[PDB]
Design a protein around this ligand. Structure first.
Ligand SMILES: NC(=O)c1ccc[n+]([C@@H]2O[C@H](COP(=O)([O-])OP(=O)(O)OC[C@H]3O[C@@H](n4cnc5c(N)ncnc54)[C@H](OP(=O)(O)O)[C@@H]3O)[C@@H](O)[C@H]2O)c1
Ligand SMILES: CC1(C)CC[C@@]2(CC[C@H]3[C@@H]4CCc5cc(C(N)=O)ccc5[C@H]4CC[C@@]32C)OC1=O
Length: 314
């Protein structure tokens, strides 16, 4: 619990535990590994409606409160509004359902998961098609603000927004709350320098996902893409500091003022990842890592690259 202060006065731990696992992984695993994460020292826990794991992640949190390991106030829990629920009337009900699943009174953070609105319904991916929806995200934002005012979410933010999409929210007439963060794909191959500079200028925290190079799911990621953790510069730095390529990638983010997530469903790696606070990179190390930037977003599929609100300029 190194934390940063958000623009609404709440505090966010700078290291977060990623809870997504693909559908093939048994649901019970999320319970086990979230408990391990809390035991290792993670306090920021990142979930979402999309993950089909809120019940398990919520149970892990409740279990660690029950056994006296943590208090609710010690945990920073995030969920996310899925893209089929962007229409304003659907936002509060979506959050309420997430709270019901997790058996929590509030989330610390609620995000718009993606700007890519989808046809309303209970299909995660609505043939089918994929079926897109055209929704003014400023209206979705107004509904998010009402969720904060109701006490359902302590803080509200966005995810996968580009600068223009963020700007549209920031310059909305009658804006009540700025997004506290923008959670985006961010790692040495896609370091988001310009977006980071923008976010900092607006008191918006950038939160990095796929900071370790993603789970390389064949549905969304080209197997040909270079494997981040196999990068020779990261490996050389790991050797230099007697750490691991994953630790180098995580430390890089912290030193740029980026809040970083790390998913692992492996006990040893969960414990390893908290070691990010135990060492430093020099200016020259950071420059070497900056040199890796190559405009590689691992999530790169036809299923969304043609969405009218797809955030990347490809
Ligand atoms: N907002 C969004 O649209 C969005 C998108 C993607 C991700 N996220 C969030 O960000 C989280 C993390 O991103 P991600 O899922 O792409 O995964 P990631 O954090 O980039 O991790 C990728 C892989 O690295 C491995 N790993 C973890 N620690 C390691 C270590 N110390 N050494 C070697 N390998 C290690 C993990 O495998 P093992 O499990 O086998 O250890 C994991 O599958 C997600 O779980 C989710 O919470 C959000
Ligand atoms: C930046 C992009 C365009 C990248 C793709 C991404 C980041 C992670 C992606 C998901 C990755 C997981 C996922 C799962 C299902 C499912 N039905 O299980 C359906 C869709 C998705 C993907 C939708 C697009 C997601 C939300 O969002 C975005 O906004």
């Amino acid at each position: 619990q190194q934390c940063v202060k958000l623009n609404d006065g709440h505090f966010m731990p700078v290291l977060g535990f990623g809870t997504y696992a693909p559908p093939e992984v048994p649901r019970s695993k999320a319970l086990e590994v979230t408990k391990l994460a809390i035991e290792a020292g993670f306090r920021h826990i990142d979930s979402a409606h999309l993950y089909n794991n809120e019940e398990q992640v919520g149970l892990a949190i409740r279990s660690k409160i029950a056994d006296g390991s943590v208090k609710r106030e010690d945990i920073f829990y995030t969920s996310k509004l899925w893209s089929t629920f962007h229409r304003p009337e659907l936002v509060r009900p979506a959050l309420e359902n997430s709270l019901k699943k997790a058996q929590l009174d509030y989330v610390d953070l609620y995000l718009i998961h993606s700007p890519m609105s989808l046809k309303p319904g209970e299909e995660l991916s609505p043939n089918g098609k994929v079926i897109f929806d055209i929704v003014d995200l400023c209206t979705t934002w107004e509904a998010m603000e009402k969720c904060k005012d109701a006490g359902l979410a302590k803080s509200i933010g966005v995810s996968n927004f580009n600068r223009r999409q963020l700007e549209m929210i920031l310059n909305k007439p009658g804006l009540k709350y700025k997004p506290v963060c923008n959670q985006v794909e961010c790692h040495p191959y896609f370091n988001r320098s310009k977006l980071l500079d923008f976010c900092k200028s607006k008191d918006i925290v950038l939160v990095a996902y796929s900071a370790l190079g993603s789970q390389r799911d064949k549905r969304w990621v080209d197997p040909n893409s270079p494997v981040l953790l196999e990068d020779p510069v990261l490996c050389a730095l790991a050797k230099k500091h007697k750490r691991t390529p994953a630790l180098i990638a995580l430390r890089y983010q912290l030193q740029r003022g980026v809040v970083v997530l790390a998913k692992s469903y492996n006990e040893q790696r969960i414990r390893q990842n908290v070691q990010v606070f135990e060492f430093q990179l020099t200016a020259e190390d950071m420059k070497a890592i900056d040199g890796l930037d190559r405009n590689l977003h691992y999530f790169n599929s036809d299923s969304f690259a043609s969405h009218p609100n797809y955030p990347y300029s490809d």
